[PDB]
Amino acid sequence: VQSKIGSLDNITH
Amino acid sequence: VQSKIGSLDNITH
Amino acid sequence: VQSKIGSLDNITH
Amino acid sequence: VQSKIGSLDNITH
Amino acid sequence: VQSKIGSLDNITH
Amino acid sequence: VQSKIGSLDNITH
Amino acid sequence: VQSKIGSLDNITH
Amino acid sequence: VQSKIGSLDNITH
Amino acid sequence: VQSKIGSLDNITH
Amino acid sequence: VQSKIGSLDNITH
Amino acid sequence: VQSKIGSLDNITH
Amino acid sequence: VQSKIGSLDNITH
Amino acid sequence: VQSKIGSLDNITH
Amino acid sequence: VQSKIGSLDNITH
Amino acid sequence: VQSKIGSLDNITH
Amino acid sequence: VQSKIGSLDNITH
Amino acid sequence: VQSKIGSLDNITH
Amino acid sequence: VQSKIGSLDNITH
Amino acid sequence: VQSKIGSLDNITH
Amino acid sequence: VQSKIGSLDNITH
Amino acid sequence: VQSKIGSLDNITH
Amino acid sequence: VQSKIGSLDNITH
Amino acid sequence: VQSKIGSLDNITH
Amino acid sequence: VQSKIGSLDNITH
């Protein structure tokens, strides 16, 4: 509700 | 509800 | 409801 | 489910 | 569930 | 569940 | 979503 | 979401 | 979310 | 019962 | 019962 | 019962 | 399941 | 389950 | 479960 | 929900 | 929810 | 919730 | 209910 | 209910 | 309920 | 519901 | 519910 | 609920 997700997994290999 | 998802998985190999 | 999805998986190999 | 979601309700008497 | 989520309610008498 | 979440309620008499 | 309400009831008596 | 309400009830008596 | 309310009830008597 | 009701599932292999 | 109700699941393998 | 109700699960292997 | 009802109402008038 | 009812109401009038 | 009811109400009038 | 599941009702009026 | 599940009701009026 | 689960009710009026 | 089991497995080796 | 089990497994080795 | 178990496992070795 | 009610189960290895 | 009610279980290894 | 009610269990190794 009225929320936001920028990212969950940023995986740099 | 009135929410936003920018990204979930950003995987750079 | 009144929501938006920009992206889910951005996979650069 | 059986809710009121993302709505506007105006009443005048 | 059986809630009022993200709504506006205005009443005038 | 059976709550009032993220809402605005205005009443005038 | 990205909308506007100018007014709902304009009443002159 | 990114919206505006100018007014709902404009009443003149 | 990133919204504005100018007013809800403007009443002149 | 044993469902997926209004949910989001993302699986990356 | 044994469901996924309004949830988010992200699985990266 | 034995559900996932409005939750977020992130699993990275 | 594997049960028996002899009688429910015996009404002598 | 594996139960028995002899009678519920015996009413002599 | 494996139980018995002989009677509930015996009413002599 | 609001049901009668495997029950017994006896009503003498 | 608001049910009768495996119960017995006897009502003599 | 607000149920009768495996109970016995006898009411003589 | 009013039944009988003589045997299930008679194994001779 | 009013039953009998003579035997289940008779094993001779 | 009013039952009998003669035996379950008769094992001869 | 999802039960084993008034049943017999025999397993031999 | 999710129970083992009035049942017999025999296992032999 | 999730119980073992009025049952017999026999295990032999």
Q: Which secondary structure element, helix H or strand E, spans residue U5, and what is its range?
A: strand U4-5
- Chain N environment of W5 (Cβ under 8 Å): 1
Residue D12 touches partner H, C-beta closer than 8 Å? yes
K13 secondary structure, DSSP code? -
CA distances for C6 relative to A9, B6, C1, L7, angstroms: 15, 5, 15, 21
d(CA V9, CA W9): 5
Chains contacting chain C through 3 or more C-beta pairs under 8 A: B, D, J
Contact assessment for residue X6 and residue W4, using Cβ atoms and an 8 Å cutoff: no
Q10 neighbourhood in chain N, CB within 8 Å: 8-9
Cα separation, W8 vs X12, in Å, equals: 14
- In angstroms, rounded to a whole number, what is the distance separating the alpha carbons of residues C9 and J11? 10
Find the closest chain E residue to I10 by CA distance.
E12
Q: Does D12 touch chain G (CB under 8 A)?
A: yes
Indicate yes or no: CB of E9 within 8 angstroms of CB of F4: no
Three-class secondary structure of residue C12 per DSSP: strand
Residue type, V4: K
Determine the distance in angstroms separating the CA of V10 from the nearest CA of chain T, rounded to an integer: 8
K5, K8, K9 ranked by CB distance to J5: nearest:
K5
Indicate yes or no: CB of W13 within 8 angstroms of CB of V13.
yes
Taking the CB of residue M13, how many other CB atoms lie within 10 A of it? 6
D1: contact with C, CB 8 A cutoff:
no
State this model's resolution in angstroms.
Answer: 2.7
Residues L5 and A13: their CA atoms lie apart, in Å, by 34
Residue L4 pairs in a beta bridge with: K4
- Tell me the β-bridge partners of J10: K10
